[PDB]
Amino acid sequence: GVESAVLRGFLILGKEDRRYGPALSINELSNLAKGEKANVLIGQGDVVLVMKRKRDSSILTDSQTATKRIRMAIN
């Protein structure tokens, strides 16, 4: 997960769920709420939302193998 890599605390969601309509910056991503997502650019060209920690993690284990969404279910 190159997206979450830089962040060092998010998960790899994807370019969907535009229902959020955030499009904010990373500096604000930290103010987000756990279990929630937020669309942030990772190259000024790809708009994808991230997924906060499911509880607690230093860098939040992730993987770029799942771009559609994350490999975890939050309820």
Side-chain angles (χ1 to χ4, degrees), residues 20-51:
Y20 283 129
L24 42 60
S25 186
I26 279 55
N27 178 31
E28 334 294 271
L29 236 47
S30 178
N31 302 269
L32 283 175
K34 248 70 182 180
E36 292 301 272
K37 279 140 290 182
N39 293 265
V40 285
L41 353 163
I42 40 178
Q44 292 64 269
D46 307 280
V47 178
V48 297
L49 46 159
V50 248
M51 235 260 69

Tab-separated table of all heavy atoms in Angstrom, residues 20-51:
chain	number	residue	atom	x	y	z
A	20	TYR	N	-18.746	10.394	0.034
A	20	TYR	CA	-18.078	11.132	1.098
A	20	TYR	C	-17.819	12.573	0.667
A	20	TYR	O	-17.951	13.504	1.462
A	20	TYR	CB	-16.747	10.461	1.455
A	20	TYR	CG	-16.885	9.212	2.299
A	20	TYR	CD1	-16.262	8.026	1.932
A	20	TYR	CD2	-17.621	9.230	3.476
A	20	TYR	CE1	-16.373	6.894	2.709
A	20	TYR	CE2	-17.739	8.100	4.260
A	20	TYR	CZ	-17.112	6.933	3.874
A	20	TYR	OH	-17.226	5.806	4.653
A	21	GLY	N	-17.456	12.740	-0.603
A	21	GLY	CA	-17.178	14.058	-1.150
A	21	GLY	C	-16.315	14.929	-0.248
A	21	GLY	O	-16.671	16.079	0.013
A	22	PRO	N	-15.172	14.417	0.250
A	22	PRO	CA	-14.277	15.177	1.110
A	22	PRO	C	-13.189	15.892	0.318
A	22	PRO	O	-13.160	17.121	0.258
A	22	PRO	CB	-13.681	14.096	2.005
A	22	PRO	CG	-13.697	12.842	1.183
A	22	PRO	CD	-14.660	13.056	0.035
A	23	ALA	N	-12.294	15.113	-0.286
A	23	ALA	CA	-11.214	15.669	-1.090
A	23	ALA	C	-10.343	16.624	-0.279
A	23	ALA	O	-9.927	17.671	-0.779
A	23	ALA	CB	-11.797	16.378	-2.300
A	24	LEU	N	-10.059	16.259	0.969
A	24	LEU	CA	-9.232	17.095	1.833
A	24	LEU	C	-7.760	16.706	1.729
A	24	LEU	O	-7.365	15.957	0.835
A	24	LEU	CB	-9.705	17.014	3.289
A	24	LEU	CG	-10.088	15.619	3.792
A	24	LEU	CD1	-8.905	14.669	3.710
A	24	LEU	CD2	-10.597	15.704	5.221
A	25	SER	N	-6.953	17.223	2.651
A	25	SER	CA	-5.526	16.938	2.662
A	25	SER	C	-5.174	15.930	3.753
A	25	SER	O	-5.995	15.616	4.613
A	25	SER	CB	-4.735	18.229	2.872
A	25	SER	OG	-3.341	18.002	2.749
A	26	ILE	N	-3.944	15.432	3.707
A	26	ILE	CA	-3.467	14.457	4.682
A	26	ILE	C	-3.369	15.069	6.070
A	26	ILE	O	-3.714	14.434	7.067
A	26	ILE	CB	-2.084	13.899	4.283
A	26	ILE	CG1	-2.231	12.805	3.226
A	26	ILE	CG2	-1.347	13.367	5.504
A	26	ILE	CD1	-2.991	13.243	1.992
A	27	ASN	N	-2.881	16.299	6.130
A	27	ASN	CA	-2.732	16.994	7.395
A	27	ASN	C	-4.055	17.011	8.156
A	27	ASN	O	-4.088	17.208	9.370
A	27	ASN	CB	-2.236	18.420	7.159
A	27	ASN	CG	-2.099	19.209	8.445
A	27	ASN	OD1	-1.809	18.651	9.503
A	27	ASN	ND2	-2.309	20.518	8.362
A	28	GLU	N	-5.141	16.798	7.421
A	28	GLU	CA	-6.480	16.782	8.004
A	28	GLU	C	-6.917	15.345	8.258
A	28	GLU	O	-7.764	15.075	9.108
A	28	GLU	CB	-7.474	17.465	7.065
A	28	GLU	CG	-6.834	18.490	6.146
A	28	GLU	CD	-6.288	19.688	6.897
A	28	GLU	OE1	-7.051	20.654	7.105
A	28	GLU	OE2	-5.098	19.661	7.277
A	29	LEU	N	-6.329	14.433	7.493
A	29	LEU	CA	-6.621	13.006	7.602
A	29	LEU	C	-6.457	12.507	9.036
A	29	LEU	O	-7.141	11.577	9.457
A	29	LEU	CB	-5.687	12.225	6.675
A	29	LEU	CG	-6.366	11.322	5.642
A	29	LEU	CD1	-7.484	12.055	4.927
A	29	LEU	CD2	-5.345	10.836	4.632
A	30	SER	N	-5.545	13.125	9.779
A	30	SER	CA	-5.295	12.728	11.161
A	30	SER	C	-6.455	13.129	12.070
A	30	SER	O	-6.657	12.535	13.130
A	30	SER	CB	-3.990	13.347	11.659
A	30	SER	OG	-3.752	13.016	13.017
A	31	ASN	N	-7.214	14.137	11.650
A	31	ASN	CA	-8.358	14.609	12.426
A	31	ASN	C	-9.582	13.732	12.174
A	31	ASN	O	-10.605	13.864	12.845
A	31	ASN	CB	-8.675	16.063	12.073
A	31	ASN	CG	-7.499	16.986	12.326
A	31	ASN	OD1	-7.355	17.544	13.414
A	31	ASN	ND2	-6.649	17.150	11.319
A	32	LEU	N	-9.464	12.837	11.197
A	32	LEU	CA	-10.547	11.924	10.846
A	32	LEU	C	-10.930	11.039	12.029
A	32	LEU	O	-10.278	11.061	13.073
A	32	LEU	CB	-10.121	11.036	9.676
A	32	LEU	CG	-10.149	11.685	8.295
A	32	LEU	CD1	-9.576	10.730	7.261
A	32	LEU	CD2	-11.567	12.089	7.919
A	33	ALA	N	-11.993	10.262	11.850
A	33	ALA	CA	-12.463	9.349	12.881
A	33	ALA	C	-12.205	7.907	12.460
A	33	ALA	O	-12.355	7.565	11.289
A	33	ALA	CB	-13.942	9.571	13.154
A	34	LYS	N	-11.815	7.067	13.411
A	34	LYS	CA	-11.531	5.666	13.113
A	34	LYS	C	-12.742	4.965	12.510
A	34	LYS	O	-13.884	5.367	12.733
A	34	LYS	CB	-11.072	4.929	14.369
A	34	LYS	CG	-9.619	4.498	14.311
A	34	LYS	CD	-8.678	5.690	14.395
A	34	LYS	CE	-7.222	5.265	14.276
A	34	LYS	NZ	-6.295	6.426	14.356
A	35	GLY	N	-12.477	3.912	11.743
A	35	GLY	CA	-13.545	3.164	11.107
A	35	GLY	C	-14.162	3.918	9.947
A	35	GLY	O	-15.051	3.409	9.265
A	36	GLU	N	-13.684	5.139	9.725
A	36	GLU	CA	-14.187	5.979	8.644
A	36	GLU	C	-13.176	6.088	7.511
A	36	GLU	O	-12.032	5.646	7.633
A	36	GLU	CB	-14.531	7.373	9.164
A	36	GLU	CG	-15.716	7.396	10.114
A	36	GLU	CD	-16.981	6.846	9.482
A	36	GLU	OE1	-17.715	7.629	8.844
A	36	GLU	OE2	-17.236	5.632	9.625
A	37	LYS	N	-13.616	6.672	6.403
A	37	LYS	CA	-12.759	6.849	5.240
A	37	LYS	C	-12.708	8.304	4.808
A	37	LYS	O	-13.372	9.161	5.393
A	37	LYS	CB	-13.258	5.996	4.079
A	37	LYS	CG	-12.828	4.544	4.149
A	37	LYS	CD	-13.955	3.620	3.730
A	37	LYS	CE	-15.069	3.607	4.769
A	37	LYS	NZ	-16.170	2.677	4.394
A	38	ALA	N	-11.914	8.578	3.776
A	38	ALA	CA	-11.787	9.939	3.253
A	38	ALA	C	-10.974	9.963	1.967
A	38	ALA	O	-9.841	9.486	1.933
A	38	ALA	CB	-11.152	10.850	4.292
A	39	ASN	N	-11.544	10.573	0.927
A	39	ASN	CA	-10.892	10.651	-0.376
A	39	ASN	C	-9.740	11.644	-0.388
A	39	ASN	O	-9.930	12.846	-0.200
A	39	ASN	CB	-11.910	11.033	-1.455
A	39	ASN	CG	-12.948	9.952	-1.683
A	39	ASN	OD1	-12.804	9.117	-2.575
A	39	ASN	ND2	-14.002	9.963	-0.875
A	40	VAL	N	-8.542	11.117	-0.612
A	40	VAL	CA	-7.341	11.932	-0.684
A	40	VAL	C	-6.497	11.534	-1.886
A	40	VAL	O	-6.384	10.351	-2.211
A	40	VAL	CB	-6.490	11.826	0.593
A	40	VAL	CG1	-7.134	12.609	1.721
A	40	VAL	CG2	-6.287	10.374	0.992
A	41	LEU	N	-5.913	12.524	-2.547
A	41	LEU	CA	-5.082	12.264	-3.717
A	41	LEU	C	-3.739	11.681	-3.299
A	41	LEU	O	-3.204	12.021	-2.243
A	41	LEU	CB	-4.853	13.543	-4.527
A	41	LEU	CG	-5.645	14.769	-4.067
A	41	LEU	CD1	-5.042	16.036	-4.653
A	41	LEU	CD2	-7.106	14.639	-4.468
A	42	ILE	N	-3.199	10.801	-4.132
A	42	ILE	CA	-1.913	10.174	-3.853
A	42	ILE	C	-0.894	10.502	-4.935
A	42	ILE	O	0.222	9.983	-4.932
A	42	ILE	CB	-2.045	8.646	-3.735
A	42	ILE	CG1	-3.014	8.108	-4.791
A	42	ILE	CG2	-2.502	8.262	-2.334
A	42	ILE	CD1	-3.165	6.601	-4.765
A	43	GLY	N	-1.288	11.370	-5.858
A	43	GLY	CA	-0.401	11.762	-6.938
A	43	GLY	C	-0.963	12.903	-7.761
A	43	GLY	O	-0.588	13.083	-8.920
A	44	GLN	N	-1.870	13.671	-7.162
A	44	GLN	CA	-2.492	14.803	-7.841
A	44	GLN	C	-3.215	14.349	-9.106
A	44	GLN	O	-3.459	15.146	-10.012
A	44	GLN	CB	-1.442	15.863	-8.194
A	44	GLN	CG	-0.845	16.563	-6.981
A	44	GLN	CD	-0.064	15.623	-6.084
A	44	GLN	OE1	-0.611	15.038	-5.149
A	44	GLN	NE2	1.225	15.474	-6.365
A	45	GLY	N	-3.562	13.065	-9.154
A	45	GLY	CA	-4.254	12.529	-10.313
A	45	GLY	C	-5.189	11.390	-9.961
A	45	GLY	O	-6.167	11.144	-10.669
A	46	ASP	N	-4.892	10.691	-8.871
A	46	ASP	CA	-5.718	9.572	-8.434
A	46	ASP	C	-6.402	9.889	-7.110
A	46	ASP	O	-5.746	10.030	-6.079
A	46	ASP	CB	-4.872	8.302	-8.296
A	46	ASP	CG	-4.077	7.998	-9.551
A	46	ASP	OD1	-4.660	7.439	-10.503
A	46	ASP	OD2	-2.869	8.317	-9.581
A	47	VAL	N	-7.727	9.999	-7.148
A	47	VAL	CA	-8.498	10.296	-5.952
A	47	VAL	C	-9.028	9.015	-5.315
A	47	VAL	O	-9.945	8.382	-5.837
A	47	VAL	CB	-9.681	11.234	-6.266
A	47	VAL	CG1	-10.510	11.491	-5.019
A	47	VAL	CG2	-9.177	12.542	-6.859
A	48	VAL	N	-8.438	8.645	-4.185
A	48	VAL	CA	-8.838	7.442	-3.467
A	48	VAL	C	-8.958	7.724	-1.973
A	48	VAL	O	-8.162	8.475	-1.413
A	48	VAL	CB	-7.827	6.296	-3.678
A	48	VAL	CG1	-7.772	5.887	-5.141
A	48	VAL	CG2	-6.447	6.703	-3.184
A	49	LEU	N	-9.942	7.108	-1.330
A	49	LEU	CA	-10.156	7.303	0.099
A	49	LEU	C	-9.323	6.328	0.905
A	49	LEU	O	-8.902	5.291	0.397
A	49	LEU	CB	-11.638	7.173	0.488
A	49	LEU	CG	-12.389	5.983	-0.108
A	49	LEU	CD1	-13.626	5.665	0.716
A	49	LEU	CD2	-12.781	6.270	-1.540
A	50	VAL	N	-9.055	6.684	2.157
A	50	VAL	CA	-8.278	5.828	3.026
A	50	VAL	C	-9.131	5.293	4.143
A	50	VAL	O	-10.225	5.797	4.393
A	50	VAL	CB	-7.056	6.539	3.620
A	50	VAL	CG1	-5.806	5.932	3.036
A	50	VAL	CG2	-7.110	8.037	3.364
A	51	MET	N	-8.611	4.281	4.819
A	51	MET	CA	-9.316	3.646	5.915
A	51	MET	C	-8.470	3.668	7.174
A	51	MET	O	-7.406	3.053	7.233
A	51	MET	CB	-9.653	2.211	5.534
A	51	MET	CG	-11.130	1.885	5.659
A	51	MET	SD	-11.533	1.002	7.180
A	51	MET	CE	-11.254	2.279	8.403
